[PDB]
Subunit: 459 residues, 4 copies
Amino acid sequence: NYRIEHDTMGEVRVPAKALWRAQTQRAVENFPISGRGLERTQIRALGLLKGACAQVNSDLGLLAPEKADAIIAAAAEIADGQHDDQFPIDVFQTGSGTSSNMNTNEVIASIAAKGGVTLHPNDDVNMSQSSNDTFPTATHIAATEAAVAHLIPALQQLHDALAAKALDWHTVVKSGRTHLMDAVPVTLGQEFSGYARQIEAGIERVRACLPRLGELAIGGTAVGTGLNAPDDFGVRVVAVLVAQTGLSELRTAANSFEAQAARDGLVEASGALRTIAVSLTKIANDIRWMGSGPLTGLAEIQLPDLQPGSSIMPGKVNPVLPEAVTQVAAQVIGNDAAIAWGGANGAFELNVYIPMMARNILESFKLLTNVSRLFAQRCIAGLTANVEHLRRLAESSPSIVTPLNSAIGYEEAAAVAKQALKERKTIRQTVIDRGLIGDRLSIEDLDRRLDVLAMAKAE
Amino acid sequence: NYRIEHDTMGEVRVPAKALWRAQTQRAVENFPISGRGLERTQIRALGLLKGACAQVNSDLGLLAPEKADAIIAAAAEIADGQHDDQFPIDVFQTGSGTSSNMNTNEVIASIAAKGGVTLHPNDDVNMSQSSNDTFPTATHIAATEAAVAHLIPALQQLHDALAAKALDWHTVVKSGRTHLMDAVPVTLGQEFSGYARQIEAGIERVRACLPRLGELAIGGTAVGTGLNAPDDFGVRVVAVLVAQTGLSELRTAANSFEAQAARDGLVEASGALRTIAVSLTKIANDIRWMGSGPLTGLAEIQLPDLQPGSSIMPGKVNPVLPEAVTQVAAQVIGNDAAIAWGGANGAFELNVYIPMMARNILESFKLLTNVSRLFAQRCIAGLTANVEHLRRLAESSPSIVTPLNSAIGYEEAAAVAKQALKERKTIRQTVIDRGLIGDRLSIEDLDRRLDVLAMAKA
Amino acid sequence: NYRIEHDTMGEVRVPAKALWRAQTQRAVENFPISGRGLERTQIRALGLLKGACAQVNSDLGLLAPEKADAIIAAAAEIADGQHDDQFPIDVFQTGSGTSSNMNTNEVIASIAAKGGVTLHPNDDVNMSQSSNDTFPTATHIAATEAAVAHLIPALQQLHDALAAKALDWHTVVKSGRTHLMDAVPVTLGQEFSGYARQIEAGIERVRACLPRLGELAIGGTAVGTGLNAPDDFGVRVVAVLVAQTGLSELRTAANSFEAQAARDGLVEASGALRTIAVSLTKIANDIRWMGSGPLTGLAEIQLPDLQPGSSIMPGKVNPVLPEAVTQVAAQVIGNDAAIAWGGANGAFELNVYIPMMARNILESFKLLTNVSRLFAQRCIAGLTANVEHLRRLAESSPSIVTPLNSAIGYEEAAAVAKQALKERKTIRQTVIDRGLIGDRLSIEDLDRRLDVLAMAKAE
Amino acid sequence: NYRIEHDTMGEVRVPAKALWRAQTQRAVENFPISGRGLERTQIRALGLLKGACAQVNSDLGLLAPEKADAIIAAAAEIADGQHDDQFPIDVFQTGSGTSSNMNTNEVIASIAAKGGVTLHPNDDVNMSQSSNDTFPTATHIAATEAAVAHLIPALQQLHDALAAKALDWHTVVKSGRTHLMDAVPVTLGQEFSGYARQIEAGIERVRACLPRLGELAIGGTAVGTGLNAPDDFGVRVVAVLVAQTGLSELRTAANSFEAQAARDGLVEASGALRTIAVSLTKIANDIRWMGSGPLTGLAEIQLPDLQPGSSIMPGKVNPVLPEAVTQVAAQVIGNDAAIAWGGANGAFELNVYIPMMARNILESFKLLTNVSRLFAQRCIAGLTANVEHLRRLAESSPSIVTPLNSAIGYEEAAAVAKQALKERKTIRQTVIDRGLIGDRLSIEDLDRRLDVLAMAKAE
């Protein structure tokens, strides 16, 4: 049921059917901490990087073409997700990600062996590389792809759903709320245009971090000097990665020492994700408050029904998607604090918090991507406004008596506001009931002064 | 103008009327970062400690009685707040608080010189001491005093105001809300008993941290070994401090190395303050939402008017104290993250983040103390309930069909709640209209089960 | 392929072999956010609670004995870990944990149906219950068990390893370091007694939070009033749970409204875990710095070799366990910020951030437990001291002039330390060269005061 | 000693010599919380804004020129700092900053009264304004000025000091450190070029947030609709503010509802400040570790002496500026968490956490500005390298034996590395001592293979 493998420290017993070897098995026994390993996106990025490195080593005549072809074929299988069960090392491993780097090299060597090609995991699969430049490179590839190919399109879909509702509800007049108290009129469309701008500003924030998030350490080797790698190894690997993936945001780092001694690009990108979580909290909280009730809440809008709300209270339906959004936002805030903590504590030539920082930034990208699409499609798209109820409260608000001052005086306007609340009537009906229609104020003049939609000043 | 002072590094120009000397002046020029120095409570604790150290050196015959008397007299003036303008060093100074320690030593030496007593700031005022044991000792004295003499009585005052409302509003029935949606009846008194328990648990949390917050490093000197101090210096200084402050929570550290290499007691105490901030956010948010509107909100309660809110919108009054509470809570959360960051980054024999950690913990104590008293007196005490509106809300919730589950089942009760909402009819009428009155449920049993105050089970 | 199931909202297509029903399937389609569900400990606690609830309903004659026997049998299989693949709902679900509660109810109903017993998931399995009191109860059961049965024994094992080193290295003199600069002598044993106290205070912190962490909401039902449950349901369920788990820390909540409107006990417990993470960072950082180099570092101690560190740099072995400890500590800091965020944002009768708060607190417990045992066994236990090098460092520090303050004063002692460093001479020789030997200080008194082990003042 | 003032709530006793009136005095009694009010920069921004508003109201013929001139003259005095003792309201005030807005209006009215001009604090000084658009406008003016006029020049000064040291130390060869262990050679110049890039990337991060940090709410009034303000009030006020201050980054908000319902621009800018704090922690930690000792540390560099280090240990000097930097960084991390907390908790038309968010963001700008200049001038500029010691350790490192493999074999190279450490000799001397110089390897060939500066691959 087991086999014997070797490294510079001795013999190691490895499960017979595992594609990994001695160094991965040592890491399995050294780090049983979370029971969770690398994600699909991380394994994909490691496979992409190893294939591109083999291509460049072959191009420079440093690696035999048959060996390079075997790495490229094996690495493509890893990048496609055919061997995700061959990456058992915990996230909480050696801080440079050496163990997961060794894990990729050993799995490539075992795949190639099945095709009759002998590869040395270090001498062939890790040629011109170090763990110190490859694991952060794979991390930054995965984070750049998560930003460009998944998060930005998901945020754009949420922006478009919010902007469509802002247009549908352009004339849906309602009463404004400041400090949670009755204020002057607004439209439901104006509030949703505000939410749309928060998401649009979110996309701008992600785009602004891309020139530094896309910076790759590849070619810097052990300390950033590029020792034991060709001088143009970095630019050549990046050129191959851009041609294969289409991820134009990928680039060699401006400074090779900053690219390995620190992970400031991840701290920066997390700050953008954290700001999006802050924006999403406001939007989701306002939406669940607008849908509150039906009889003891605000009852401004109706959220689409997604599932029975209670195991005990029958008929009750809860805002389950705003709840999922606010919980994701809390997770992003938490992950952000762990990333910054890891980011600050590098030492000299290497920051050794990379696997922990990678786990947190990639999870925040994933959670925000998936919850934004669900929020857009299963909540925002199907919202219904209680138009008549919203207009009635705006027309019954004591805040709209101020344009009556030049006709009846502020004293009489305050008396109108007081009687309207007491009798639960509109300001218009109260002005009529108090016998104020005459030479001083006509009904046409009253409807002009109390035009709540005009007070909202919609475009 | 200026005068010339000196230290082991050379000459320094010091302002003519300043009671501080060379090393304080170097610190004034080295750290112009925030423009803020030690607080009144920090200067008081440094004053108390220097006086206590002089008393013990005198008792052990290590310092001449007249020299000790001059330090005790000068340290009493510092602790009293007579020389607060003589402490100009920034909070963001050397991480051990060496500069602020030398500031106390130099100011004491100058006050004593006015009385004709010559004291060496290092050899006499700092006898048997180090900044490594004195600055964290003064920090832990200040934090222990802030917890025991100020925060706990303020939280007790808030608890008592909340518990009094819970008693007054014991039968004030209203609709419960879960996920912000209409739920089964509760009383306003039941919710306020919930808030009172949160504050009561807050006091319990502060009291549970006191055995480690009260631990003092005094006696450990430079690295915790107690070199250049008598073997019982620490226990004797703590005994003088306990007698003078009445703070029995003050004690010698269990391990003299942990007491200087780490500031874990401040990280622990901040965690309790952070939980109180979390409890206060929920209480303040619920109260401002209960007072929201009136027309566009819940309009459940009325908050006392504390100041005009708007001129453009006549008579608009805002929940200003809940706003002050939630902003304070945000600050406590922030200060907590700063404290934990500093606490983790100690190295070998000393954690060099003490002035920053002291600033943040003492501010969190002060903010929570002051806002809790204002919240209790200017908001909670004067709250009034809209009793008739609240009863109408309790009776309008469709979730009042819940006690009928044992009689008609969950699925049939769901069909009742949905039909009642669609046809704009009561739960009672919908049960009758769906022909549910029979052997399993009589009309008298239905009226008994639908009583909203009885449903709240007060 | 699929079968038809139903809830109060309508029909749902459920996979043919799934033990879950309509409401779990709705939750599978509503929340595909993280791709991760409840942990083994959460499923165990839900299993234990459902069994205990069925036992009490049976004792009070509210549920037929055969129906109760089937629930107890099915709930025991769930708690044992036989049906973990039957819990597919995401962590980022409805904030009350309604979906995961219905998941337990539906799986129990399907297991019992295999034995010829017909159970209604709401009316029978959820009898006298709500998700509002059961999901936070299962969370607090899991967190209390993690604290008492797992974390405290792991921290005790770490304390014992640190205290054993403190005893072995009692007279291993070295130079103290403050601000990273040369200070007066200490022993390696004295520093390790400091680390042992930090872990001992960590256990004290966990124990101090237990009276509130152990508080269970069971019996409070929908809003905390206990409507649709017997008056003593809570005390009876807690008594069954204490008897079955041996966890005397489990108790009924002091206030049934605070127990559901807030999750303050989890915020409090996280604060204790965060302080342990802060203590572990200092201990792990000091140990990796003591083992640094050897040539370019402090080279004070030797850490046991756990795996090869480099192939390019032969024989380079890295402090992999301190790296795992400091990365875990960063994760605990992050999880703590997420927990506090969720805890503050409750509204009226319910805090709807429980699944997120549960994920983060239980992960922090698991990470600290597992890394503390590995740190104690694979790092602390096998540490070796470079005794001769350490004594030379103690003797080389110029700060050894400190015990002469009572004899020559601070100012004269400063002139000694500075002259000794400038002329590359010892403190002893500089005191002689500056003509300081006389009545105030004899040569025998100087040699007595300059003894580095005596200066460390070891008990 | 006191006088009677009035508002819509009644009579208020005010100190006789105070320039503030009834509404400010109410706020003094309502909020005694921190004992700290608005900073100099906040008062300056409020004065600038009120003067610009009076100018626009006069230009549009809405305010009498004599009244406008009196506001402009009074507001200029406030902006200059002549009346900072007239702003006693606590930071922890009403969340919109209404109290501080009223404070500015009342002080302006009292200054103008001394010149014989009667102003109504609301009708004249607050004309076309609301607290909801003015306090966040003043906050964003102060934050934009702090970024552009103070932080960016202070960071540029720190970058230039670090880059100058990187050039001075271009050939100062030393041994690299990864995981705190001995690694291949680097230069001290290469590490400082890394630090310089972190600060340069910091400036880029601050510049990237300016398009949204500079957005002003002015003209949006109570709810963002612009009701009771001229349609072009916002663009006209911003035009005046840009012309007077030269702060071209100031602009009207893209969306008037997003500009008042949220403070996402402050959360975003804080994220940039937090990333700078993370970068500064790494730079300051490396510098104090490089300067550690002088005899029990790394002793790579010498920091300039700034003050006596210890009250007890004479002659000892501590890295006081790296300590001030790392403490400031911790404060920025803390302030960042408070800003995000406030940012997420807005409701409907207004975020009511503005005074707390303003305090924290402006303090972080101030702390980073002042500590960067002090770090550049009192620490970085005067650093000295221990050149001979650094070269000796690099030439004695077992890591540099790898280029000997093609001459003597890896087995003999490992034996050379082992003997070199044992005898505390250079690799070069050990190769000679082992009698390896011959036909297989000449001394010229040995010096070429062991050229440590060439191994660092300096530009």
